[PDB]
């Protein structure tokens, strides 16, 4: 869940249009990730990892660290 977390961090940067590194335990809404951006992040992770994810993905695991453990578990 380490290699994958930084890739999730990269997709978040693309959705937010940002270049700074992200705190893995920082809830994504404090970065300004709204509901539309979470949809885009969910769809980008499906296409990037080739796997199925629920669209309530980001709201289940609201941090990079939580997302990476979820995504590694079933992937």
């Amino acid at each position: 869940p380490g290699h994958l977390a930084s890739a999730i961090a990269d997709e978040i940067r693309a959705v937010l249009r940002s270049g700074d590194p992200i705190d893995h335990h920082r809830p994504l809404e404090t970065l300004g990730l709204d509901a539309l951006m979470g949809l885009e992040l969910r769809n980008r992770l499906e296409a990037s990892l080739g796997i199925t994810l629920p669209v309530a993905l980001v709201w289940a695991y609201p941090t990079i660290s939580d997302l990476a453990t979820a995504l590694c578990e079933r992937m």
Binding site: T30, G32, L36
Partner: protein
């Protein structure tokens, strides 16, 4: 009126909206921890929408009070009050009411643009996609649908404390300025009643969509 929220909710529900972040606003002390680690954009929308909410609350006689957030991020209103808040680029808005007159309310504001690539398929039922294609040209029906689905969740959650997915409601949009949401999952509320359908209203003005749902008492 001239305000977007006021045009889609009855007058018994006071509302307030600002299209910019005025200089010098600040959160209440109890609200500061919720944005202490948040980016400036997020801080600003949080602070401004709560100025709006406290303005609407004062009309109902409620004095300055923090509006904290619950377990799924829902705003925590004073007892006897229901309400909804929304922020997007160029809009901060809030509406509130007393439980003696309305059971629940949700609002959502979106820019009147097409949805980003891929989003419509994520949020629309196959039947909804055909219905949007039959609607008259000149309106971004895809963004209206996404807006109305969120308003449906915002009205649904204070009543059920349950998740509602995008595939869990069928929204029908009328050029009227009205829409309907048909709940496709079990709709047991927390008062015993069953929630099957919501009545919604929508307006497009100043480059924004605004949708609203009032659940009558």
């Amino acid at each position: 009126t001239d305000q977007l929220i006021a045009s889609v909710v009855p007058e018994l529900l006071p509302s307030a909206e600002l299209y910019e972040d005025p200089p010098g606003l600040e959160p209440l002390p109890e609200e500061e921890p919720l944005i202490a680690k948040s980016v400036a954009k997020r801080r600003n929308e949080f602070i401004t929408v709560r100025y709006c909410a406290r303005q609407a609350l004062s009309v109902l006689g409620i004095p300055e009070v923090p509006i904290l957030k619950g377990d799924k991020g829902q705003p925590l209103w004073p007892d006897g009050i229901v309400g909804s808040m929304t922020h997007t680029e160029g809009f901060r808005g809030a509406v509130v009411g007393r439980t003696g007159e309305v059971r629940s309310v949700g609002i959502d504001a979106e820019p009147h643009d097409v949805l980003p690539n891929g989003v419509l398929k994520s949020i629309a039922l196959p039947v909804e996609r055909d219905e949007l294609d039959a609607l008259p040209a000149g309106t971004h029906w895809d963004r209206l649908l996404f807006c109305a689905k969120e308003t449906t969740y915002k009205a649904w959650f204070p009543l059920t404390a349950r998740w509602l997915g995008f595939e869990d409601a069928h929204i029908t949009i009328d050029p009227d300025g009205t829409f309907t949401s048909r709940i496709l999952v079990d709709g047991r509320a927390n008062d015993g009643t069953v929630l099957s359908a919501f009545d919604g209203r929508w307006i497009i003005d100043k480059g924004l969509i605004l949708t609203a749902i009032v659940v009558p008492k």
